[PDB]
Symmetry: none
Subunit: 30 residues, 10 copies
Amino acid sequence: ATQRLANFLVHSSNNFGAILSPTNVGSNTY
Amino acid sequence: ATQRLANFLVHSSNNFGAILSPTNVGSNTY
Amino acid sequence: ATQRLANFLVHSSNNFGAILSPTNVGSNTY
Amino acid sequence: ATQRLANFLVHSSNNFGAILSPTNVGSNTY
Amino acid sequence: ATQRLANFLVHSSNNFGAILSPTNVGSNTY
Amino acid sequence: ATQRLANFLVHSSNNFGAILSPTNVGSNTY
Amino acid sequence: ATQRLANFLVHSSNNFGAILSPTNVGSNTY
Amino acid sequence: ATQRLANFLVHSSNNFGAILSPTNVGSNTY
Amino acid sequence: ATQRLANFLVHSSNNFGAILSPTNVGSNTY
Amino acid sequence: ATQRLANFLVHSSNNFGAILSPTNVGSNTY
């Protein structure tokens, strides 16, 4: 059992409210 | 069992409310 | 058992409310 | 059991309120 | 059981309020 | 616009690999 | 726009590897 | 825009490796 | 924009390794 | 923009290693 993972960015959330408008953006390139 | 994964971005959510308008955007390129 | 995965973006959700209008957009290119 | 992980950035959250507009951005490159 | 992790940056949060607009940004490179 | 939701459990995922065998189980009752 | 939500449990994930076998279980009751 | 949420438990994750077997359990009651 | 949230417990994570077996449990009651 | 939050407990983490088995437990009551 082997895994090779190239460069990355990791995040996580939960969010709740009366009004939600989180902005999440990313434009990564190979 | 082997896996090779190129560069990536990972996120996760759950969200709830009276009004939901999260913006999620991404335009990655090979 | 082998897998090769090129560059990618991954997200996940569940969302619920009185009014839902999440925006999800992406325009990735090979 | 072996894993190789290239350079990365990791964050995590939960957030809630009356109005949510967190900005999360990243544009990492291989 | 072996893991090799390249250079990285790690952070964590929870945040809540009436108005949330945290900015989180990063543009790391391989 | 009104919604009434009784007690519940919520989860979400994405998963991938060479071999996948996640177990998800639940037996809730009214 | 009004929502009423009874008692609940919320979680979220993404997971990946060579072998995946997460266990997720719940048996909530009304 | 109004929301009423009863007692709850919230968590979030991302996890990855060669072998994954997280256990997540909950049996909440109304 | 108004939100009312009853008593709760909040946590967050990211975790990774060769072998993952975190235990997360909760049995809250209304 | 108004929020009312009842009594709560908040924690956060990130954890990683060769073997992970954190225990997180809670059984709060309304």
